[PDB]
């Protein structure tokens, strides 16, 4: 019972990060993939593509917003009442139920498809971290105006946590040269993806 | 004898050639062999379960 | 541990759980020193007794 | 001595339920990156006018 | 803050802690007492020792329900407390402000509905080893009020993996959830020194209950078999299946039927069915019931009954040894729990300032024992004529008569 | 310093001694009472004599939990102490400063929460032979305070290899760890003269407990077998396996089934199942229970009960012999332990100067026995009219009435 | 040389011991043995032990390192951080993570200084960087190798 | 390694033909074969017995 309860309690994170994994495949409200290079903001073309997700999480809504429909009501089958114990040798069944699902809040406030690394001050750090940063800083909306995005969240798999910490947390990057992204975006651990 | 078959004309998960299907009623409950693969083959009775030992 | 919470479409799979019972025995250890009874009293510096 | 300690293994051995449930899920993370939107319908829809 | 010093935040008092755990309210007891064997009981107790209190709590509930003698003893013991008058007293040599605080708290408790139910729910910890009552906090303007008291089943909690004396809610996580400050009234009476899991009285009473259950079930079965004897029919070779069925039905109905006829080639033998007595079963039941009575209420009045016999000192003889001790212990523990959990939040929320914890008012139960008025009234005049100056306060307090106002 | 003269350093009082032994808090009792035989019990006791107190402590805990009669007796004995009023008195012909110190200590103990729990935890040493309670020391400015009292299981300690009367913590080393001064309240009541391992009452009570357990289990088994008789079926040569199984099922169900038919070539014989009585088992249980009652509470009121009978001197008759002696012994030993362990650190930390150890205040329990007011009130007037000048202090003290203020 | 990366805050501790019986003292004093009457005046003193270690979790322990600190890209970045990534990438049944949090580093005295350099100094061995500063606290020992 | 040896010239009951007489044979505390015959042959010693590490 308690094991199933803890599994159910963990479930929402699995749901959210499964949707995050599928972000390169799932489609946002525009009609293209959440992380795609052909977002149709205008008759022109706009693009936002280890499945990381730089996120500002500062606007009125956050990316990959969760939707809690039903709690983890425990489902049990431990009484002869049912036909499981009739047709079988006293097989009881213990279950947890959920009624939730992930969401794709906005595909113009996230970015993915990273060739992440922290070799050189910029020539390898701005390869992805600063491309996401400046792209979001200058994402345009209807009416040719900036979205005023403030990227301050970085979600990466476990393998990339060391590189993320080096990018944000150390004055020098990998050669004792410099690190323009120090104390810029706070990274968080995650293993549900990759 | 056979401890159980759990067939009900439905297997748990008979996955072959890279695709997982549900048919042929190949459900067993014993540690005779392939227990590690028995976990994969079994552990998914989507439909009802009916146990009728074949006494094999 | 439980299987991951999967999606729901038409019916629920009644999964199962494994077990990895681990066996390990016990061993016995000893260390002893043989000393002369007379020698422990036949000392004035308080040594060969604390040993 | 004893003739066959081989068969008496079952009685001797004890249980140490210390490896039981000696694990846990990763710390919750959707809070930092995702916001909860409680709902009670079957298909929630969001509308914005730009 | 609370008595334990944990920081207190009034934001979390608007909603119960368990409100965000709607899964708990939908659970049903598993009834582990049905089909219970000594091995199963031992496993249940051992698992409870390790932090799995759900099965133990459900077993205790079933044990309470299914045993009439045990239920009667526990109900009598609890009703003993429920009938005691209580008062709130200020601390030692309290000041005017402290006296006013104590008076206000006393008035608030008098006008607080559901106090008796709260005491009854708290007293469940005597048998279960711990009782948790959730509080509903509401604001009628500027003063916090306990809206209601909710008793949560003991099956809703567990033990902290890092601490065997600290209880936690079951929130599907390995470590559970810590209890919210000011959100519960936890009563944990201590009959025996040890951890919370081992502290219940039902843990002591479990084995006699199982003995009595087995004896009663066996006696019921033996009474069912009693009556007619088992009789076996024998048939010779060459008896067909129809004749076999006829012989079987004849044997089956022969006990009820006074007379019957069979061929000389057949035979019916009447064998003993069940010959003995109820003496062993009843002896076991009496032993178990005496053990339960001694464990619950003492072996001076219940099991080895004190018998009849009145007199002026009869009240003292019946009460002081055993009964008074148990009554005082239970009342004092309940009063301490209440003063810790309910009085303190009211004092620190409903009144200004930060009074020192050591000076908080304490709830006191009236344990005064009826004293013989006639003998003592005879005694005073001699003493006062001798010259002794006995204070009137002692007399008024001990007799129960109030001082003139 | 402490009473024993060991140097005292206030640096070590900030943290409990066992804090750096996080391994202890994660242990679980091994329950050595299950599957216990006389040989196992003898080995456990002998090993305990040699410094392995863990198994003995766990066995004692199981014994306390699994025996209802023993648990009731011990609980009654301890609750007798828990209900006694207590006071702190200054030393013989104390001076004004000593009187002030005693008064301050008395006030501090009155306002110290958890005193009853401390007494209950200390009284466990009666049965276990030694009880250790860890102290939490905190500073509320300039005055040290006992934050809380923690009772540590007896299984956490051992014997010093170089001293059989000195206890030590289990820190994975052969010699253990010496107990921190001012960090514990060790209560070691002395029922019998000897070493600490042999000093427990449960060591005396172990054998009657095992006798009762064996008798009860055997009686339960015999009650289970009682009822139907064992009946054996016989078949002739040439009976196939299917017919053998049919005969076996018929025999198995024949006891419940009133009637049945078999071929004349077969045979069923009903043999005695278990014929006797519960008299031997119950005799053994009664013997063991009487032994336990005599050992715990004396053979004048519990085992050989004093029976009914009131009167003015009935209180004295019931109490003075046996009950008063045991009450006074336990109360005096507990008071001595408390005065040694808790009063002294408070005096030497919370007050200035270095008072001599011989002049420390002593905690005293109120052992005053209710005296017949009526008879004595009749008696005084004759004596005073005769001419005797009886002091009023003796009267006020003996009657329980306080002197006028 | 002799490395091991272990968790310490988990509900289980790697290489769990078993203090089955205490350090009972066995002695041969006088009229208790025959070594002292029908023999020389010999006495033996012994300490009986009945313990044994355990291999608790082989899916959370990592070893066989070329433990090194240099270049922050080839020696430490590819060995110690490789172990970091491997331990944090462990997946249980169903593909979920084990929540492995490597915080114990055990090495013999020979590797003490180099382990301290890996964890404790901002620069690894050339002034480049040290990503593993204050991530795993190392306890020195000599019982191994 | 085999634990179990008797090397004190000690006596054990070994039965040759119709009688059991002093002799030292198996003399081990572990058994995998001839258990039924070993019991008669491996009767614990009559005299002083001391064990060693043959490691055979």
Author numbering:
A (entry chain bQ): 103 to 151, 160 to 304
B (entry chain bR), H (entry chain bK): 53 to 108
C (entry chain bL): 52 to 102
D (entry chain bQ): 2 to 51
E (entry chain qp), F (entry chain qr): 5 to 409
G (entry chain bL): 160 to 304
What text appears in the publication on this structure?
A pentamer of major capsid proteins on one of the capsid vertices is replaced by a connector complex formed by twelve copies of each portal (gp32) and adaptor (gp41) proteins and a hexamer of stopper proteins (gp42). The asymmetric reconstruction of the capsid–portal interface shows the symmetry mismatch between fivefold symmetry of the capsid and twelvefold symmetry of the portal. The portal complex is surrounded by five hexamers of major capsid proteins. Two major capsid proteins from each of the hexamers contact the portal. One of the major capsid proteins binds the portal complex with its extended loop and peripheral domain. The second major capsid protein, which is positioned counterclockwise when looking at the portal from the inside of the capsid, contacts the portal with its peripheral domain. In contrast, at the interface with the portal complex the N-terminus of the major capsid protein (residues 2–14) turns back and forms a short α-helix positioned parallel to the extended loop of the neighbouring major capsid protein, thus leaving more space around the fivefold axis for the portal complex. The reduction of symmetry from the twelvefold of the connector to the sixfold of the tail occurs at the adaptor–stopper interface. Asymmetric reconstruction of the JBD30 virion connector complex contains double-stranded DNA passing through the portal channel. The DNA does not interact with the stopper proteins and continues uninterrupted into the tail discs.
